[PDB]
Design an enzyme around this catalytic site. Structure first.
Site, mmCIF file in Angstrom:
data_model
loop_
_atom_site.group_PDB
_atom_site.id
_atom_site.type_symbol
_atom_site.label_atom_id
_atom_site.label_comp_id
_atom_site.label_asym_id
_atom_site.label_seq_id
_atom_site.Cartn_x
_atom_site.Cartn_y
_atom_site.Cartn_z
ATOM 1 N N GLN A 125 -11.271 -4.099 -2.406
ATOM 2 C CA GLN A 125 -10.619 -4.856 -3.450
ATOM 3 C C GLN A 125 -11.401 -5.031 -4.745
ATOM 4 O O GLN A 125 -12.602 -5.124 -4.744
ATOM 5 C CB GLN A 125 -10.172 -6.241 -2.916
ATOM 6 C CG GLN A 125 -8.979 -6.838 -3.702
ATOM 7 C CD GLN A 125 -7.927 -5.803 -4.052
ATOM 8 O OE1 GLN A 125 -7.902 -5.219 -5.200
ATOM 9 N NE2 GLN A 125 -7.081 -5.573 -3.035
ATOM 10 N N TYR A 127 -11.494 3.399 2.589
ATOM 11 C CA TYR A 127 -10.216 2.946 2.106
ATOM 12 C C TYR A 127 -10.396 1.912 1.029
ATOM 13 O O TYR A 127 -10.844 0.856 1.359
ATOM 14 C CB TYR A 127 -9.393 2.438 3.258
ATOM 15 C CG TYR A 127 -7.965 2.171 2.802
ATOM 16 C CD1 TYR A 127 -7.042 3.221 2.760
ATOM 17 C CD2 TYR A 127 -7.590 0.888 2.397
ATOM 18 C CE1 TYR A 127 -5.726 2.976 2.359
ATOM 19 C CE2 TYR A 127 -6.277 0.644 1.986
ATOM 20 C CZ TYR A 127 -5.342 1.686 1.978
ATOM 21 O OH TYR A 127 -4.055 1.440 1.619
ATOM 22 N N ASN A 130 4.115 -9.750 7.014
ATOM 23 C CA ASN A 130 3.016 -8.808 7.278
ATOM 24 C C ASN A 130 2.574 -8.905 8.715
ATOM 25 O O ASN A 130 1.770 -9.753 9.044
ATOM 26 C CB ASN A 130 1.800 -9.151 6.382
ATOM 27 C CG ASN A 130 0.577 -8.232 6.555
ATOM 28 O OD1 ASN A 130 0.632 -7.148 7.130
ATOM 29 N ND2 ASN A 130 -0.564 -8.667 6.054
ATOM 30 N N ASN A 153 -8.922 -0.054 -2.795
ATOM 31 C CA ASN A 153 -7.921 -0.125 -3.885
ATOM 32 C C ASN A 153 -8.523 0.157 -5.245
ATOM 33 O O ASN A 153 -7.869 0.696 -6.174
ATOM 34 C CB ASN A 153 -7.214 -1.472 -4.023
ATOM 35 C CG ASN A 153 -6.217 -1.827 -2.929
ATOM 36 O OD1 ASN A 153 -5.499 -0.990 -2.377
ATOM 37 N ND2 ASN A 153 -6.258 -3.090 -2.535
ATOM 38 N N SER A 194 0.794 -1.231 0.000
ATOM 39 C CA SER A 194 0.000 0.000 0.000
ATOM 40 C C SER A 194 0.807 1.251 0.000
ATOM 41 O O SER A 194 0.285 2.324 -0.375
ATOM 42 C CB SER A 194 -0.971 0.041 1.165
ATOM 43 O OG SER A 194 -2.174 -0.623 0.869
ATOM 44 N N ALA A 225 1.003 -3.231 3.104
ATOM 45 C CA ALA A 225 1.181 -4.676 3.253
ATOM 46 C C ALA A 225 0.710 -5.514 2.061
ATOM 47 O O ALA A 225 -0.213 -5.170 1.326
ATOM 48 C CB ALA A 225 0.496 -5.170 4.521
HETATM 49 B B1 APB Z 1 -2.583 -1.798 1.961
HETATM 50 O O1 APB Z 1 -1.518 -2.958 1.674
HETATM 51 O O2 APB Z 1 -4.136 -2.360 1.714
HETATM 52 C C1 APB Z 1 -2.472 -1.407 3.582
HETATM 53 C C2 APB Z 1 -3.345 -0.478 4.137
HETATM 54 C C3 APB Z 1 -3.275 -0.224 5.505
HETATM 55 C C4 APB Z 1 -2.388 -0.943 6.312
HETATM 56 C C5 APB Z 1 -1.530 -1.904 5.769
HETATM 57 N N1 APB Z 1 -0.662 -2.629 6.551
HETATM 58 C C6 APB Z 1 -1.612 -2.147 4.396
#
Ligand code: APB
Length: 357
Positions: free
Chosen positions: A117, A147, A340, A149, A61, A315
């Site tokens: 996702q 939040y 992770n 993607n 991320s 992550a």
């Molecule tokens: B991302 O890889 O979706 C992400 C967002 C928030 C925290 C972490 N560890 C990853």
């Protein structure tokens, strides 16, 4: 490293590795605008290959920072505007929902419920469009932060449209290169395969699997050195020779929306410095970080504030990263691990070390 720094890192990191059972880790502290590196453990346990400053790690991320920065540069170039409706760039996106959703919404997770996702069954450009056209919003645009993607990925796919380039070429040409991130890749070439660490999830060695809008949302691989260089650039935008990038960096750190005591930039997330550690630590947790939250608009947005705690966690299934910096104090850190592990733990450590300077 000056002993102070050494002591700090070691004091904080070692125990973290021990407890978390992290196989490898690299850290860089940016102190007074100078980086100091530390590595530990393995990149590849089987072959007992250690973590070095050359080891490549999956940013997960944290790639979103790049995305957000490539987007600002596009804005600075006059190629797109955040205020432009999405349809201007994807005119086939004809459904009524799309109506009032702008680039700004996408880029900030405030479109109205886009999923975290992209469904794994979505493969082709056809699947994609369908996916988008058929998505039904839960909320009105600009009211709730989610939040996602599929939100940011999409923004980055479209930001590069006017340029004519593919997402990768544009990132390379417009971001990596000018900054001298020569060991930063979306797709790691053969010549670099040897330095690419194995992620480790459940004892098994793993690599990020490809998927829709992966490059745009979570596809970067980089090293502790390039990471540090990326942190220095964001800390001192003004020293960046390329006008657009410089400007682009600043826009990514602009404050567009607020929730709780956090502000949403373009990929970056910021807080006011000084900060309440409970805030960032606990805020970082998934249950909280990934939940739906109401946002307040900042009209007009606030330009990059030197007094901030700037950061982003990241992550993949085998890796976990964290970046934080305080422009006003010329300090930052970068933590890369091929495992992770939990957010708050990252946060805690970063804050401990950074609080000590
Ligand atoms: B991302 O890889 O979706 C992400 C967002 C928030 C925290 C972490 N560890 C990853």
């Amino acid at each position: 490293a000056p002993q102070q720094i050494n002591d700090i890192v070691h004091r904080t990191i070692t125990p973290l590795i021990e407890q978390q059972k992290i196989p490898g880790m690299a850290v860089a502290v940016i102190y007074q605008g100078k980086p100091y590196y530390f590595t530990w453990g393995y990149a590849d346990i089987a072959k007992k290959q250690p973590v070095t400053q050359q080891t490549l790690f999956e940013l997960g991320s944290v790639s979103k920072t790049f995305t957000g920065v490539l987007g600002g540069d596009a804005i600075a170039r006059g190629e797109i505007k955040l205020s432009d409706p999405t349809t201007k760039y994807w005119p086939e996106l004809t459904a009524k929902q799309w109506n009032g959703i702008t680039l700004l919404h996408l880029a900030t997770y405030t479109a109205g419920g886009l999923p975290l996702q992209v469904p794994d069954e979505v493969k082709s450009s056809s699947d994609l469009l369908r996916f988008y056209q058929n998505w039904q919003p839960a909320w009105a645009p600009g009211t709730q932060r989610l939040y996602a993607n599929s939100s940011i990925g999409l923004f980055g796919a479209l930001a590069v449209k006017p340029s004519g380039l593919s997402f990768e070429q544009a990132m390379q040409t417009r971001v990596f290169q000018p900054l001298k991130l020569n060991h930063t890749w979306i797709n790691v070439p053969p010549a670099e395969e040897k330095n690419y660490a194995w992620g480790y999830r459940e004892g098994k060695a793993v690599h990020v699997s490809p998927g829709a809008l992966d490059a745009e949302a979570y596809g970067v691989k980089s090293t502790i050195e390039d990471m540090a260089r990326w942190v220095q650039s964001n800390l001192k935008p003004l020293d960046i020779n390329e006008k657009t990038l410089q400007q682009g960096i600043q826009l990514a750190q602009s404050r567009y929306w607020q929730t709780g005591d956090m502000y949403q930039g373009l990929g970056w997330e910021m807080l006011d410095w000084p900060v309440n550690p409970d805030s960032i630590i606990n805020g970082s947790d998934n249950k909280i970080a990934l939940a739906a939250r109401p946002v307040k608009a900042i009209t007009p947005p606030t330009p990059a504030v030197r007094a901030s705690w700037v950061h982003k966690t990241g992550a993949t299934g085998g890796f976990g990263s964290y970046v934080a910096f305080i422009p006003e104090k010329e300090l930052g850190i970068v933590m890369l691990a091929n495992k992770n592990y939990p957010n708050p733990a990252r946060v805690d450590a970063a804050w401990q070390i950074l609080n000590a300077l």
